[PDB]
Amino acid sequence: KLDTRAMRHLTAEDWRVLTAVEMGSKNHEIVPTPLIEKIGVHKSIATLAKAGLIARMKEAKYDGYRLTYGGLDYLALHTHAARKDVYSVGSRIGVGKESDIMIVADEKGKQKVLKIHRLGRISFRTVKRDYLRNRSTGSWMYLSRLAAIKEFAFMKALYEEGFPVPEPIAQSRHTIVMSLVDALPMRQVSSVPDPASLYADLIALILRLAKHGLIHGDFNEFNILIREEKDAEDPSSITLTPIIIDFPQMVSMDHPNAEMYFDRDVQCIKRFFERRFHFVSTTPGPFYKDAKKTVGKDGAKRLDAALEASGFTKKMAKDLEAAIREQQESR
Write out the residue range of the structural domain in which residue 9 sits: 1-85
Helix axes 314-328, 137-160, angle to 10 degrees: 100
85 carries a ligand binding annotation: no
The residue among 183, 210, 228 that closes a domain is 183
Domain count, the chain: 3
Residue 101 exposed, middle or buried by CB count within 10 Å (0-12, 13-18, 19+): middle
21 is in an annotated binding site: no
Cα–Cα distance measured from residue 97 to residue 104, given in angstroms and rounded to the nearest whole number? 20
What angle, rounded to 10 degrees, do the helices at 69-82 and 12-24 form? Answer: 120
Distance CA 15, CA 9 (A): 11
Is the CB of residue 27 less than 8 Å from the CB of residue 60?
A: no
Q: Long-range contacts for 89-98 (Cβ within 8 Å, ≥24 apart)?
A: 89/4, 89/7, 89/114, 93/1, 93/2, 95/1, 97/121, 97/331, 98/327
State whether 190 and 300 are in the same domain.
yes
Please tell me whether residues 196 and 102 are part of one structural domain: no
Cα three-residue angle 152-113-199, rounded to 5 degrees:
75
Domain end residue (candidates: 68, 85, 102)? 85
66 within 8 A of 36, measured Cβ to Cβ: no
Residues 137 and 204 in one domain: no
Name the nearest CA neighbour of 221 among 277, 174, 168: 277
**295 labeled part of a ligand binding site:** no
Residues 121 and 193 in one domain: no
State yes or no: 134 annotated in a binding site: no
Same domain, 160 and 32: no
Q: Are residues 211 and 73 part of one domain?
A: no
Q: Which residues neighbour 173 within 8 Å (Cβ) at sequence distance 6 or greater?
A: 72, 75, 76, 79, 141, 144, 145, 148
> Which residue type does 229 have?
E
Phi and psi (nearest 5°) for 215? -125, 120
CATH of residue 321: 1.10.510.10
Report the Cα–Cα distance between both ends of the chain, in Å, rounded: 20
- Same domain for 120 and 221, yes or no, is no
Of all helices (H) and strands (E), which one includes residue 115?
strand 111-117
- Cα–Cα dist 76/228, whole Å: 33
The whole-angstrom separation of Cα 90 and Cα 77 is 13
218 given a catalytic annotation = yes
231 shares a domain with 96: no
How many other C-beta atoms are found inside a 10 Å radius of the C-beta of residue 260? Answer: 13
3 state SS of 195: helix
Is 86 annotated among the ligand-binding residues? Answer: no
CB 141 within 8 A of CB 117: no
Q: Which of 218, 263, 290, 298 is catalytic?
A: 218
Resolution of the experimentally solved model in angstroms: 2.5
Give the CATH number for residue 6: 1.10.10.10
172 is annotated as contributing to ligand binding: no
